[PDB]
Amino acid sequence: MMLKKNDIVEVEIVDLTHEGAGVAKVDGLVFFVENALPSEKILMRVLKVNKKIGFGKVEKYLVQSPHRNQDLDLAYLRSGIADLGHLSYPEQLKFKTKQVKDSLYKIAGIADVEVAETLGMEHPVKYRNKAQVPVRRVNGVLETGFFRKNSHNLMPLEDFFIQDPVIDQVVVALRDLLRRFDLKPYDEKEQSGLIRNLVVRRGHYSGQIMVVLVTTRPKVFRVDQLIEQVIKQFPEIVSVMQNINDQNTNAIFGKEWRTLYGQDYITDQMLGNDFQIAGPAFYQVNTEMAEKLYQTAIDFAELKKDDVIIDAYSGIGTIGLSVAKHVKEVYGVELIPEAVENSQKNASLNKITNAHYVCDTAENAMKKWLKEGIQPTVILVDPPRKGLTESFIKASAQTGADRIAYISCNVATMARDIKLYQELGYELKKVQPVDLFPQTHHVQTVALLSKLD
RNA sequence: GUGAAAA
Ligand SMILES: Nc1ncnc2c1ncn2[C@@H]1O[C@H](CSCC[C@H](N)C(=O)O)[C@@H](O)[C@H]1O
């Protein structure tokens, strides 16, 4: 055949990638096609031909999937806000379950462990308690929005679909204030301007709002007036922070934080307890579903009064502090000073005195605790996407903890890590996926591993 | 390197 860019070829979509792209096979090439679902027949325009793969685009739909959601605004697909939004919600859940099974088999060689059907959200919309929104000049106008996938091209948006609608309103109000005061958006190309991002977090139960102005420099022209106006429109704002990021980095936050108004934290609830939450601290973005995730992990772990728990990657302390009053001891490790400081305070708020935190990397803390002779019976881990280090895994396995509950937002690194745990005497017992990120391709899981002897 | 998150 010898396909080239611009050729039009008729293909059937036969699979979805982990990121939600349609898969077609033509002349020994695997083609990836945006906005194309399994069983769809399309005319595909060839965009790019590599050696073993190609990239295509839908030129014309000949037959569409019975599971296609016709109502999705394509802006949400292209901006990567809802990159599975073109699929019906029940089939999103089935896709996520399949991804977990496929990953455990392909990466860990596990085919015989029960993976429960992904726990779905009843109304899987408007759920995020945080927005991290770039501010850029687009056609001469200051705009808030989101990047087109695989780019830094800002697509202006006001309705973000999957955010707390109050957050959407706050972001728009802030955008309009930035225009009114003629504050200059960040320009990555020219390394100029002031306003890089607006971050807004709103407590899922409490409704308390933190605004963060992420800027290139300390001085913001008439920020006091800006703050005055925004708190008038939104009296639930308890905190306006500034974060100063003077580097050319894709990391949203730089090192320097300043309180411009009110508190340096919001308070919200999880599993009936109160948690203070700093701007730079992590907080699960779908509180409703994160509670169910935590409860699954707790249920899996079969906690007893004599248990000694490690809460690794503990953040503001939500997981360990949810169980502290039912176990003997909780030991937590968290890298970010502001977050571990939240956890310390949070223990005190909830009258917990058997929770002990260290500010360190998880692997360092694990080695130190192993040296001190801490005797954990249960290790709970909740790492970022990159997963655990081999040194942490090996160290954790030397404790002889009989139960490990791995909470993961990236099944590829979880499966890799599970494969190492299985080499060190742990057996994967069960896996429960939970839909923390509806409308997106992202899968959250909890896995229970238990020590063979 | 954090729903998107280029070089
Ligand atoms: N190498 C490392 N060691 C310890 N903590 C780390 C780390 N890398 C990232 N972190 C922290 O790991 C956390 C992952 S988010 C999970 C936090 C918490 N368990 C919760 O459910 O809310 C973040 O707080 C992040 O700052």
Numbering used by the authors: 0 to 452
Authors' own words:
An 8-nt (5′-745GUUGAAAA752-3′, hereafter termed as U747L) or 12-nt (5′-743CCGUUGAAAAGG754-3′, U747SL) U747-containing RNA analogue representing the loop region of hairpin 35 alone or with two additional adjacent base pairs (743C-G754 and 744C-G753) was therefore crystalized with the construct of 1–454 of RlmCD containing a E443Q mutation, using S-adenosyl methionine (SAM) as the cofactor. Given the higher resolution of RlmCD-SAH-U747L complex structure, further analysis of protein-RNA interactions for U747-containing RNA substrates was mainly based on the RlmCD-SAH-U747L ternary complex. In the structure of RlmCD-SAH-U747L, the RNA substrate interacts with RlmCD significantly using a combination of hydrogen-bonding interactions and aromatic stacking. As the methylated target, the U747 base flips out of the RNA loop and interacts with residues within the active site of RlmCD. In detail, the U747 base forms multiple hydrogen bonds with the side-chain groups of D381, Q283, and Q443, while the O2′ and O3′ of U747 ribose contribute two hydrogen bonds with the side-chain of R384. As the immediately adjacent nucleotide to U747, G748 also participates in the formation of two hydrogen bonds with the main chain of Q131 and the side-chain of Q162 using its base. The aromatic ring of F145 inserts into the space between the bases of G748 and A749, pushing these two bases further away from each other and forming aromatic stacking with both. Consequently, two partially joined stacking networks (Arg127-G748-Phe145-A749-A750-U746-G745 and Arg127-G748-Phe145-A749-Phe146-His151-A751-A752) were formed as a “λ”-shape geometry in the complex structure of RlmCD-SAH-U747L.
However, in S. pneumoniae and Bacillus subtilis, which both belong to gram-positive bacteria, RlmCD and its homologue YefA have been proven to be dual-functional methyltransferases to catalyze both m5U747 and m5U1939 in 23S rRNA. We previously determined the crystal structure of apo-form RlmCD, which highly resembles that of RumA and contains three individual domains, including the N-terminal TRAM domain, central domain, and C-terminal catalytic domain. In all structures, the cofactors were modeled as SAH, due to the missing electron density of the methyl group, while its density was clearly observed attaching to the base C5 atom of U747 or U1939, indicating that the complexes gained in the crystal structures all exist as the trapped enolate intermediate 3, given that E443Q eliminates the final step of proton abstraction from C5.
